Amino acid sequence: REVINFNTKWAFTKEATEVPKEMPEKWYWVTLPHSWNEIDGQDGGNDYYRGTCYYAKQLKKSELPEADCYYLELRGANASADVYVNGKAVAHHDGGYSTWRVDITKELTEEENLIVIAVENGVNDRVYPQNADFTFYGGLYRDVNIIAVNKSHFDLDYYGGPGIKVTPEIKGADASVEVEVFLTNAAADQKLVYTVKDAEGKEVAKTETAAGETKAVLSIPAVHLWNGKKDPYLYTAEVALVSGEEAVDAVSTRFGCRTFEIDPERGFILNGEEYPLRGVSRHQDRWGIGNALLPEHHREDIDLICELGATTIRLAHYQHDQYFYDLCDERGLVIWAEIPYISSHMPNGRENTISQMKELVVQNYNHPSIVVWGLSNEITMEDLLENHRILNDMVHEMDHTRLTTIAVVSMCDIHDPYIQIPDVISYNHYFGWYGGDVSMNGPWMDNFHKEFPNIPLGMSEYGCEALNWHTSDPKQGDYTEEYQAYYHEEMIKQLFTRKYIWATHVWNMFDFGADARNEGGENGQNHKGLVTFDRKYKKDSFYAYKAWLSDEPFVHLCGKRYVDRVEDTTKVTVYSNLPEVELFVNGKSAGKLQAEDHFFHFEVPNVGESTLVAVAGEYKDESHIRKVDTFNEEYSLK
Amino acid sequence: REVINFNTKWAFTKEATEVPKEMPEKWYWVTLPHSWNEIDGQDGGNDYYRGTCYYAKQLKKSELPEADCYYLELRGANASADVYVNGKAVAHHDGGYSTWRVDITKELTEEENLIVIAVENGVNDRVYPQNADFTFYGGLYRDVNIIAVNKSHFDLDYYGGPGIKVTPEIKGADASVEVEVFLTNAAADQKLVYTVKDAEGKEVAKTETAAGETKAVLSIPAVHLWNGKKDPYLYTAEVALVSGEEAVDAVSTRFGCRTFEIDPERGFILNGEEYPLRGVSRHQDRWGIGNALLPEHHREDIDLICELGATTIRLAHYQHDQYFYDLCDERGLVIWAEIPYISSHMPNGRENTISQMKELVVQNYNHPSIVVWGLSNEITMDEDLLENHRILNDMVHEMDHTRLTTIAVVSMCDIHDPYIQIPDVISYNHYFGWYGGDVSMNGPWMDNFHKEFPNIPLGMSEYGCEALNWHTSDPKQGDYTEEYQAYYHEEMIKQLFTRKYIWATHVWNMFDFGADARNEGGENGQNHKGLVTFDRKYKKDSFYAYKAWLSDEPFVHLCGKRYVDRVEDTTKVTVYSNLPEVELFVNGKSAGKLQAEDHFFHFEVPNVGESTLVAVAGEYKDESHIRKVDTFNEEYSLK
Amino acid sequence: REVINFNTKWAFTKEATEVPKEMPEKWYWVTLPHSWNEIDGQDGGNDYYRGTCYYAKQLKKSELPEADCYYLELRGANASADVYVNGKAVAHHDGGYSTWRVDITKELTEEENLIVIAVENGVNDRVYPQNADFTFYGGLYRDVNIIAVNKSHFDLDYYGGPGIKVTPEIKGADASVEVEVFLTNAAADQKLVYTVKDAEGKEVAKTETAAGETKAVLSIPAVHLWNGKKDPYLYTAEVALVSGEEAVDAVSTRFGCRTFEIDPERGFILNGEEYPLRGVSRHQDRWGIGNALLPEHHREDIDLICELGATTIRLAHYQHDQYFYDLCDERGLVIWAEIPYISSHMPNGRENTISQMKELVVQNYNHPSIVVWGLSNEITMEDLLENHRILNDMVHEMDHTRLTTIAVVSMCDIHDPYIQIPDVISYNHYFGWYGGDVSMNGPWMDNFHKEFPNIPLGMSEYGCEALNWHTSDPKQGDYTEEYQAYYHEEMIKQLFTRKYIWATHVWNMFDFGADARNEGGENGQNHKGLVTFDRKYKKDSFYAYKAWLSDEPFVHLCGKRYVDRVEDTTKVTVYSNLPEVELFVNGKSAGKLQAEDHFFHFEVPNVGESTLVAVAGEYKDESHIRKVDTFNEEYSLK
Ligand SMILES: Cc1cc2nc3c(=O)[nH]c(=O)nc-3n(C[C@H](O)[C@H](O)[C@H](O)COP(=O)(O)O)c2cc1C
Ligand SMILES: Cc1cc2nc3c(=O)[nH]c(=O)nc-3n(C[C@H](O)[C@H](O)[C@H](O)COP(=O)(O)O)c2cc1C
Ligand SMILES: Cc1cc2nc3c(=O)[nH]c(=O)nc-3n(C[C@H](O)[C@H](O)[C@H](O)COP(=O)(O)O)c2cc1C
Ligand SMILES: [Ca+2]
Ligand SMILES: [Ca+2]
Ligand SMILES: [Ca+2]
Numbered sequence A, C: 001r002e003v004i005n006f007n008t009k010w011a012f013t014k015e016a017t018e019v020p021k022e023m024p025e026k027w028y029w030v031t032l033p034h035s036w037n038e039i040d041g042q043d044g045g046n047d048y049y050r051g052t053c054y055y056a057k058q059l060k061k062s063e064l065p066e067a068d069c070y071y072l073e074l075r076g077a078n079a080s081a082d083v084y085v086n087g088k089a090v091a092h093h094d095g096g097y098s099t100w101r102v103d104i105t106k107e108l109t110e111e112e113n114l115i116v117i118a119v120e121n122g123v124n125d126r127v128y129p130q131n132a133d134f135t136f137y138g139g140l141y142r143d144v145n146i147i148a149v150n151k152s153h154f155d156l157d158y159y160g161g162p163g164i165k166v167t168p169e170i171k172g173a174d175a176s177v178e179v180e181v182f183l184t185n186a187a188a189d190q191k192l193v194y195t196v197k198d199a200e201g202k203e204v205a206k207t208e209t210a211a212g213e214t215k216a217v218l219s220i221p222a223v224h225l226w227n228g229k230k231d232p233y234l235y236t237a238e239v240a241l242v243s244g245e246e247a248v249d250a251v252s253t254r255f256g257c258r259t260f261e262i263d264p265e266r267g268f269i270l271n272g273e274e275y276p277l278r279g280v281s282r283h284q285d286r287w288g289i290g291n292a293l294l295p296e297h298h299r300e301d302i303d304l305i306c307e308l309g310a311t312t313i314r315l316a317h318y319q320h321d322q323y324f325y326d327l328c329d330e331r332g333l334v335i336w337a338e339i340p341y342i343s344s345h346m347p348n349g350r351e352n353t354i355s356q357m358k359e360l361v362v363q364n365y366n367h368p369s370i371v372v373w374g375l376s377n378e379i380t381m382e383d384l385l386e387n388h389r390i391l392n393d394m395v396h397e398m399d400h401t402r403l404t405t406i407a408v409v410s411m412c413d414i415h416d417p418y419i420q421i422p423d424v425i426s427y428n429h430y431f432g433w434y435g436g437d438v439s440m441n442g443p444w445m446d447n448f449h450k451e452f453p454n455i456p457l458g459m460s461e462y463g464c465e466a467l468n469w470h471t472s473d474p475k476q477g478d479y480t481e482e483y484q485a486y487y488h489e490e491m492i493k494q495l496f497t498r499k500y501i502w503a504t505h506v507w508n509m510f511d512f513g514a515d516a517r518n519e520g521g522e523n524g525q526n527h528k529g530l531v532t533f534d535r536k537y538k539k540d541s542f543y544a545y546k547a548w549l550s551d552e553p554f555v556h557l558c559g560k561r562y563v564d565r566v567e568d569t570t571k572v573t574v575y576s577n578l579p580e581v582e583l584f585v586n587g588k589s590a591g592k593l594q595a596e597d598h599f600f601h602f603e604v605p606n607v608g609e610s611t612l613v614a615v616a617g618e619y620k621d622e623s624h625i626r627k628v629d630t631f632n633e634e635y636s637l638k
Numbered sequence B: 001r002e003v004i005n006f007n008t009k010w011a012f013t014k015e016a017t018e019v020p021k022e023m024p025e026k027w028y029w030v031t032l033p034h035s036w037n038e039i040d041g042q043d044g045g046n047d048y049y050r051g052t053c054y055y056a057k058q059l060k061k062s063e064l065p066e067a068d069c070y071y072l073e074l075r076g077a078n079a080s081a082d083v084y085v086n087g088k089a090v091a092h093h094d095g096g097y098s099t100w101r102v103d104i105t106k107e108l109t110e111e112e113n114l115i116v117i118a119v120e121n122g123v124n125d126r127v128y129p130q131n132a133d134f135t136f137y138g139g140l141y142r143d144v145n146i147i148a149v150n151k152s153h154f155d156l157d158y159y160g161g162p163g164i165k166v167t168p169e170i171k172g173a174d175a176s177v178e179v180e181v182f183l184t185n186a187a188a189d190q191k192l193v194y195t196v197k198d199a200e201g202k203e204v205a206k207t208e209t210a211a212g213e214t215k216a217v218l219s220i221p222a223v224h225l226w227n228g229k230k231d232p233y234l235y236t237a238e239v240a241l242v243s244g245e246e247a248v249d250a251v252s253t254r255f256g257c258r259t260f261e262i263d264p265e266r267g268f269i270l271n272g273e274e275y276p277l278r279g280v281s282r283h284q285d286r287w288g289i290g291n292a293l294l295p296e297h298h299r300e301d302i303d304l305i306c307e308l309g310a311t312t313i314r315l316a317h318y319q320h321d322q323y324f325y326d327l328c329d330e331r332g333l334v335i336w337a338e339i340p341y342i343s344s345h346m347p348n349g350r351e352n353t354i355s356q357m358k359e360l361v362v363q364n365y366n367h368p369s370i371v372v373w374g375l376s377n378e379i380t381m382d383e384d385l386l387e388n389h390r391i392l393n394d395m396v397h398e399m400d401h402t403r404l405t406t407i408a409v410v411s412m413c414d415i416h417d418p419y420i421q422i423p424d425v426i427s428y429n430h431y432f433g434w435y436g437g438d439v440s441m442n443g444p445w446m447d448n449f450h451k452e453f454p455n456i457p458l459g460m461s462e463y464g465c466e467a468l469n470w471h472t473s474d475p476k477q478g479d480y481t482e483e484y485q486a487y488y489h490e491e492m493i494k495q496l497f498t499r500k501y502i503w504a505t506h507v508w509n510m511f512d513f514g515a516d517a518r519n520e521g522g523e524n525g526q527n528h529k530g531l532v533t534f535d536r537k538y539k540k541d542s543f544y545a546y547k548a549w550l551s552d553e554p555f556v557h558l559c560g561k562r563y564v565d566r567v568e569d570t571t572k573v574t575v576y577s578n579l580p581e582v583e584l585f586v587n588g589k590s591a592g593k594l595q596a597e598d599h600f601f602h603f604e605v606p607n608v609g610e611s612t613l614v615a616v617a618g619e620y621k622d623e624s625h626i627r628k629v630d631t632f633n634e635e636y637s638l639k
Helices: A294-309 A320-332 A345-365 A383-398 A438-451 A479-497 A540-549 B295-308 B324-331 B347-364 B383-399 B440-452 B482-496 B541-550 C295-308 C320-332 C346-365 C385-399 C438-451 C481-495 C538-551
Strands: A002-005 A010-013 A028-030 A054-059 A069-074 A080-083 A086-096 A100-103 A114-122 A142-147 A164-169 A174-181 A191-196 A201-212 A215-220 A234-244 A248-255 A261-265 A267-268 A279-280 A312-315 A334-338 A370-377 A403-408 A424-428 A457-461 A501-506 A555-557 A569-576 A580-585 A588-594 A599-606 A609-616 A619-627 B002-005 B010-013 B028-030 B054-061 B069-074 B081-084 B089-095 B099-103 B111-118 B144-149 B163-170 B175-182 B191-197 B205-210 B214-219 B235-243 B246-255 B261-262 B267-270 B279-281 B312-315 B335-340 B370-377 B405-409 B425-429 B456-462 B502-507 B556-558 B570-577 B582-586 B589-594 B600-606 B610-617 B620-628 C002-005 C010-014 C028-030 C054-059 C069-074 C080-085 C088-094 C102-103 C112-122 C144-149 C162-169 C174-181 C188-199 C203-210 C215-220 C235-243 C244-257 C259-265 C267-270 C276-281 C313-316 C334-338 C370-377 C402-406 C423-427 C457-461 C501-506 C555-557 C568-576 C580-585 C587-592 C601-605 C609-616 C619-627
Touching: A002 A069, A002 A619, A002 B175, A069 A080, A086 A100, A142 A555, A164 A234, A164 A248, A174 A234, A174 C267, A191 A215, A191 A320, A201 A215, A234 B002, A248 A457, A261 A370, A267 B600, A267 C501, A279 A457, A279 A540, A279 C587, A294 A320, A312 A320, A312 A501, A320 A334, A334 A403, A334 A501, A334 B279, A345 A370, A345 B582, A370 A383, A403 A457, A403 B370, A424 A438, A438 A457, A438 B081, A479 A540, A479 B111, A540 A555, A555 A609, A555 A619, A569 A580, A569 A609, A569 C457, A580 A599, A588 A599, A588 C267, A599 A609, A609 C267, B002 C080, B002 C609, B054 C346, B069 B081, B069 C619, B089 C088, B089 C385, B089 C601, B175 B191, B175 B235, B191 B214, B205 B214, B205 B600, B246 C069, B261 B370, B261 C457, B279 B295, B279 B456, B279 B541, B295 B541, B312 B324, B324 B335, B335 B347, B335 B405, B335 B502, B347 B370, B347 B383, B347 C054, B347 C235, B370 B383, B383 B405, B405 B456, B405 C580, B440 B456, B440 B482, B440 C267, B482 B502, B482 B541, B541 B556, B570 B582, B570 B610, B582 B600, B589 B600, B600 B610, B610 C580, B620 C619, C069 C080, C069 C601, C162 C235, C162 C244, C174 C188, C174 C235, C188 C215, C203 C215, C259 C370, C267 C501, C276 C457, C276 C538, C313 C320, C313 C501, C320 C334, C320 C346, C346 C370, C370 C385, C385 C402, C438 C457, C481 C538, C555 C609, C568 C580, C568 C609, C568 C619, C580 C601, C587 C601, C601 C609
Parallel strands: A279 A312, A279 A501, A312 A334, A334 A370, A370 A403, A403 A424, A424 A457, A457 A501, B279 B312, B279 B502, B312 B335, B335 B370, B370 B405, B405 B425, B425 B456, B456 B502, C276 C313, C276 C501, C313 C334, C334 C370, C370 C402, C402 C423, C423 C457, C457 C501, C555 C619
Antiparallel strands: A002 A142, A010 A028, A010 A054, A054 A114, A069 A100, A069 A142, A080 A086, A080 A114, A164 A174, A174 A215, A191 A201, A191 A234, A234 A248, A261 A267, A555 A569, A569 A599, A580 A588, A580 A609, A609 A619, B002 B144, B010 B028, B010 B054, B054 B111, B069 B099, B069 B144, B081 B089, B081 B111, B163 B175, B175 B214, B191 B205, B191 B235, B235 B246, B261 B267, B556 B570, B570 B600, B582 B589, B582 B610, B610 B620, C002 C144, C010 C028, C010 C054, C054 C112, C069 C102, C069 C144, C080 C088, C080 C112, C162 C174, C174 C215, C188 C203, C188 C235, C235 C244, C259 C267, C555 C568, C568 C601, C580 C587, C580 C609, C609 C619
């Protein structure tokens, strides 16, 4: 079994109205990952190009390996896509966030075969998402592969799944692992070899059945538990299909062995031990390249998330890339995954919710980092309830090892009956950013918990917009770095001290692309990130969370970009996971503070040009301010 | 004077019928820098799209600052371009490598003005280059700006120049600096305020004239000499055009104060002291983006070149970006600049040679890193050709009394050819040891020319060898291995760096680069003679041969880290280092110490099982790994 | 509005080093019209100088009448040109055959302004023509003018057009004429006075509007139709731009009122009546002077074409002079005009086809002689099809009053897709000259008309080379005058008898410059003319056409240059449009013939020196022959 990368140099246009009969010669050349909205969907006006575009590329049999079957594998085509080979329709897909495949073998008539793929991201009442606060970046934004396999092979045609499914039960200090596989055109002549390898490639269990016995239970004694960031231990199930003595096809996945519970009062439980889920959400895009992410971009996103110290990520609002989920497995992050069933219930979208959800569970069942499947987000912003029951029952029938969840819009009456459908729920609240006061958040959650004490309640969104604006009068709607620091300061104090809230997710870890937005001085993005869209600047609110969640010791001065201050006595905030901070102004000491909540609020003289140095143990940070007569108007959006 | 960036979100297409009258809605969005050959001109076949493509963008007056005139400035449009404003042609330019500008004030008759730029890189007998070993990447591959200035302003119309020309003369410990300025629509009552600033922005000289006097001489006592890598000291010159009491327009440029000679026997001399020119060449492109380079890409290229330690760069084969030349001035690099008069003399290309060279000199006269202007490269690959060189050479001497002319001569050209006698200095492009012959021929070939022409300063403007991820224990010309390219450059270093009369040496090339007609070595569309790969991510072993000879950063580098599986029971392991002595350790036990005066430490090492290799010199270390196999890993072999 | 002649005494060089700062003193003096290819492009070897050349001339403000604007107008600069005023580039143009203009007022800052025009006719992949059987004569080969106008004036900046567009419609005995006008810098308080005048200069229509209303529909009572040679009646539209009581600028154009059809069975129709189009093509060059043609040369060419009696001219292969098209209007000739989209489709050439077609239509819209626009000639000798669909739509968009056509190479398959694009098509067939046999032509045409009964079909080229060689045994490839006359006798009998062939065009009316030609014993020329290159000799084939097409009575003795003949009894052809011819040999009747097809084939005793007299009524011609023992090898090319 060989996987041939098929990314290089496709022909591309928006300007075509029929599949071309022969390879286009005047189209634009792209190499995948590619989106045609990387610019016009990150800059405002809600005007990014939505419609049908064409990708063409020749497949040459001469350049292919010898095998009995050839699959086209698409890891992401947003949103709807039509595959052609030599002018003939061979596959159609709705769902921009999941893998799908088509055997093209019988169509490779020639030595030079024309693959046309049409991708459409327009408006319809049929394919989710249709209404949401993010760009539906069009195109082949994830890899396209060719898969050459033997006539008999592990299944490639069931909802883009790996062809292999792994389920551990923890029995004491051992574990039994069910490794089920799926085959296409097998012969009872053939055998199957199930192997589990440990972290060292060292074979720890093996067994051999017939090709008609497509399931096996292996034992793993003294099992190393997948225990989050403490020890994200991954095994590897591998299964070979052997014709006589020759392994003729194989497949594999990593997997972790753990148990978990989501307790209405104790919060999240991991392998029998409380393991609070405090974390962030992440969109799969980046400034300048739309959603056409490279492996390095995924690596960098999880690195920064790891530096902050999150224990959970909510991967909203759709299926993310398999590599990103793998990273979550290796690092021991606890993941919420969901489908883009969002904002506004479309009665004709029922089919597309079921097929994206099926794809989400089948393709992601083996990732030990995933614990909840999300049915919908803000969907109320009876047909709706049926759509939810159907999804809730299908997930519970596909996956006995995980629970279901929803994210609820802020205004939804808590007695809405759809809240009673999933196993757990979370609310998306913006008290103190979009209306209200930040102090309202704790009392709201408490009130829900009193009313529904046996429903585990999380916070799946909360956030506050921030760009390079500054003030000594931080308020809701000024968009300043300083007001956003305070908002997260207050949210951390309220939420991180409520054990019953089973998971919190900052909205959002990064600024992200949303072409309909036109606010804050920079249009086409949501600026509720802790980090900017290009991942180059970490806002002060990043270091408030780090102070609570990282054990790596640090000290961070807030306000570095706020230099020209008017007041004679200015406020200087310092974050540190160390217990005591001392701040110096021009070598003169403005006092010592011990903040057990890690937020050190100093009052400091503002005269002339001053350098500030905060000192906590062996660690230090440094910033500078300047006294001025008038507010530096560059600091102000208004 | 305000500079508005104008790069964001153009509509682009290759297959447009006519100049569009409304903002297109189905074209492809690009943000400049952009080249449409970023993929098809880096991958082989000599088939990159060459033709006319359109860029379209709206200019809204509501966004422009209030100003008397607005100029469209193009830093790079390859190769020929036409500019339309609300459908009317206002400008045409031939020359893909220089700045040109056009006043579009009169055509901004609407609140939204359609700005359309047609760009062409097709085949023709008139615009250089046409015949050369690199891709002619089409597009607006450098910045496009809008320049808003007062009705009286420093000249924006003379061959894309800055409007200011600085000429220092060194007199003992002091400097005399002539500053000349060029005006458009200036009034006899305006003044010119000339200032020279220190490296810290401190004013050190100041003078004034009436606008009718567009020259001034300012004194710099106790001048800080621009002295190469030792002290790349730069001043700034500022001239403001003043109406009554107010500056209505201002231009500035940095500059450095230095003298040099190119002595036929002692080589390059800088400020009276011998200053050997030992370096590389660099193309202005990069894997994946064609020649659509960002400032960080220019900074990375020069960082890598500085790390190697080159004292000179040959910026072949055309005018590079202003930011790269500034970087050279700041870092103390000595530069050869040239025009794309290349391979084959086109009789109808003469006007364009004149044009590009005028733009080359006018736009770059202020850069202290530049010491020679190159007229042509390998042009003989005949009387009309000779006259083209006389004219270029006399025009350059006419325009710039402070630099020398040079050429780059193709390997086979007879040394008695008449055109070698035309410029002030010459260099040859030789590949003995790569295109046939043997690496030992170079040194003596240079010695023989030197014997024949003892008064012609002679350099090596190209030499090099191809290398990809292929490996061998029997390196040979044409296996394309990393090891043979390493041997080749060791031997060139030994021959070239010990002959002081070779006034400048330039490895062809610092980086792998785009050449769509190349189809060899296992990866097509690239010349792989680089010391560093096309994406800048991998420094080949030959890079460290040069670092060991030219850098003062202490290091120790293990060669052959990618040649892991070896058949031989005892294997050669080369270390490069600028330290005096290296010790090699094999799975923790010493295989001995060596002291290589030419910095090339050749160890012989037992190859059994899997082995970890550690080389140690002082407090610096490097690590590699090999392992023993019974048959050659056919993945190391190009065949 | 004053037009100043600016042809006088330009400095010129072929060495294009740089634009000279001062007026030169050792270049060569030329008065335009001028081509530097006048000798080296008419003599063989395909070696005429192609490259960049400079023209330099001083413009002195004192010699200019006072006016607000000064435009340089160039009627023809072949092929690509740049204009400089005092070293400053002010215009660029690609297209050797059309008018282009540039406002240069702002650059007339000295009292002696140096005008430099760089003209280039080299090889590239972008500017047509590049591949064709004719010399691309470089230079300022048509007038250059200075046009001095008032600040407000009719448009001089739009594709070189006249500024006035005149569309006659007809219904019944009257005509209605729409006059549209286009203004630069007009002011609201200005007026437009429109007038239509008689052939005798008497006003027939008048009306006033405001400068903002730039269209007017004037009516001509009892209009005299433009009816071809029978009555080439021309009106004149004039429109004046008035400030107060003062005309500050005026433009005008002659025009003709006429309808026409191209019926696929009935052929060409003009004002309801069948009007058969039988004629010739004409290249814009002349022996000795290249294409640097004077008005007297245009007049003599058209006189010779009228004497022959053609009803149509195909003005191949490019836009001709305005003065030639005016003659065509004045004499009632029906014109085919075309752009040099020729021989071989260039992918980089699209833009230049568009620009030349725009200029062609904009500048020639008013010419009543012109009925068809030609898109291309032998262009096949998919990007091609798109290129033709763009041209076809653009012309149909710009000109609702004329049809589109093409000229198809001989071997092009009749089912080819591009033949379906234009309104009408024609072929270039040379059966009987470039292989084949002259009898094939008519039947070939019959096949097409059978295969495509409603695509009007014409013959855009057909011809046969002829120089001063002679024979009593005419065979294709002897280049004799006698074979060419036989060829044309047979082509007339086949073509002129098929009503459904909407237009026939002899290739060519005159021998013309083609520097790559090296045949027939005089290189540098295509010798397929009916008339020689210096317009001095009418070949016998000229008279075969005249006998069918002219109403002036005449008798023409063929073979006058074939004096020495070996045979005792020799063939003597007489052409005449009179019914009957008697031929006398030394005063003795050698026979009386009537010939319906006007081709009088006599046989005659050849004894001694003989004088021949051909007699029809009161009309005679005379010639001489001589009996010789052996063939005069001076009559023989080989
Ligand atoms: C995580 C997971 C992965 C699965 N993968 C496959 C597969 O790759 N091939 C297959 O044939 N069935 C696979 N199945 C089995 C189907 O879910 C099961 O057969 C289903 O009940 C019948 O599907 P159907 O209604 O489409 O016929 C998988 C099931 C789960 C839960
Ligand atoms: C480095 C340099 C820069 C110059 N810049 C300008 C300029 O910006 N504006 C101007 O009007 N003349 C400028 N000149 C003056 C021109 O050289 C002058 O017009 C000359 O006479 C024209 O010859 P050329 O075509 O060879 O440049 C400059 C000259 C030099 C050497
Ligand atoms: C025969 C003809 C002559 C024309 N002359 C002019 C003209 O002189 N000035 C002008 O502005 N437009 C002229 N137009 C065209 C219309 O005014 C045109 O729609 C508009 O001005 C520009 O359209 P474009 O994008 O095709 O250039 C002419 C059109 C035709 C068909
Ligand atoms: Ca947008
Ligand atoms: Ca290519
Ligand atoms: Ca000739």
